[PDB]
Amino acid sequence: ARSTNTFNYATYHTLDEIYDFMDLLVAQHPELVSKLQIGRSYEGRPIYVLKFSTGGSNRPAIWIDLGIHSREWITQATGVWFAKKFTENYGQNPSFTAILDSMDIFLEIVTNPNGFAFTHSENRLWRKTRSVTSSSLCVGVDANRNWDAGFGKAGASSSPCSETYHGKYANSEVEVKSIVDFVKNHGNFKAFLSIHSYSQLLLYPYGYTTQSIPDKTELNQVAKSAVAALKSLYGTSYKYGSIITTIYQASGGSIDWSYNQGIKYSFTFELRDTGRYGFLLPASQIIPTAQETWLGVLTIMEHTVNN
Numbered sequence: 241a242r243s244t245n246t247f248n249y250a251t252y253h254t255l256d257e258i259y260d261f262m263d264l265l266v267a268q269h270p271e272l273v274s275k276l277q278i279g280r281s282y283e284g285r286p287i288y289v290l291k292f293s294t295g296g297s298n299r300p301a302i303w304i305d306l307g308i309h310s311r312e313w314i315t316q317a318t319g320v321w322f323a324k325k326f327t328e329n330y331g332q333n334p335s336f337t338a339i340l341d342s343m344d345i346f347l348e349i350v351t352n353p354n355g356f357a358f359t360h361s362e363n364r365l366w367r368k369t370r371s372v373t374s375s376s377l378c379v380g381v382d383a384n385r386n387w388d389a390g391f392g393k394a395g396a397s398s399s400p401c402s403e404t405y406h407g408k409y410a411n412s413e414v415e416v417k418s419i420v421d422f423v424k425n426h427g428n429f430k431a432f433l434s435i436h437s438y439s440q441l442l443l444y445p446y447g448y449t450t451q452s453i454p455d456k457t458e459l460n461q462v463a464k465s466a467v468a469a470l471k472s473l474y475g476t477s478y479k480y481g482s483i484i485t486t487i488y489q490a491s492g493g494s495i496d497w498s499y500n501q502g503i504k505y506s507f508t509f510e511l512r513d514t515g516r517y518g519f520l521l522p523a524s525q526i527i528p529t530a531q532e533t534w535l536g537v538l539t540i541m542e543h544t545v546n547n
């Protein structure tokens with residue numbers, strides 16, 4: 241409505257509603273947050289990032305992106321809630337004020353604008369981008385199989401109509417390239433988190449290879465504590481481990497590419513639930529879900545600022 245304070249956070253919103261909300265949030269807290277357009281989607285929709293910052297140099301940053309798979313509605317909704325929480329706790333929660341006084345947070349609420357819009361008017365279960373320009377009748381690419389980390393290897397499909405089709409070449413999707421260029425140009429991101437649904441899992445690299453990352457013992461300990469934190473509010477249980485060891489071999493994922501850029505704290509959360517609702521989580525589960533990942537995400541940020 242006419243305030244983020246009167247915005248309903250326990251209901252699923254449309255693309256316009258989410259873009260509207262960003263403008264109101266900035267309008268209310270211009271000192272702490274600004275909106276940045278990092279590119280345009282296949283269909284020409286602007287792609288935005290909300291940058292939270294108290295100021296400073298090319299400060300160490302924390303990247304978070306939600307909704308790369310459009311049907312996972314619990315994610316873009318969680319992002320909306322996260323944005324408001326960042327403005328509420330600054331100046332209030334000790335640990336969070338510490339992180340924001342030394343680091344910036346970049347939050348991409350609707351990473352896949354076209355697919356999201358499509359889930360609101362055409363197919364609620366659409367999860368890919370909406371790119372065409374190919375030798376097929378089927379459209380789109382699975383934006384989480386499109387990164388340059390083991391691209392084209394076992395773990396993604398080469399079938400255009402496939403829901404996990406990887407695309408013509410690594411980073412062919414503008415939605416993927418928009419993030420890569422922004423993160424690389426910056427050259428100072430210390431954490432890269434991707435948020436999906438469902439199956440309640442905290443993942444770290446890799447997905448495209450059995451090789452164990454050198455930072456495994458640490459990232460494993462970071463995941464272990466993050467899972468314990470999250471579980472504390474309602475008892476929601478997550479399993480954690482490498483992508484390949486605990487979900488499946490998946491190539492061309494964002495966290496493997498990011499970790500390969502040298503961004504150490506690379507993780508992906510697969511939110512609620514484990515299958516009863518899957519993608520159609522009840523609106524009543526939004527704030528509760530948002531509340532708990534906040535604990536697991538804050539743990540990871542705490543580790544990054546301190547380690």
Ligand SMILES: *C[C@H](Cc1ccccc1)C(=O)O
Nearest residue numbers: 384436447490493494508510
């Ligand atoms: C979230 C789920 C598993 C995953 C995570 C990170 C990289 C690749 C795959 C997915 O299918 O996107």
Ligand SMILES: [Zn+2]
Nearest residue numbers: 309312436437
């Ligand atoms: Zn997903």
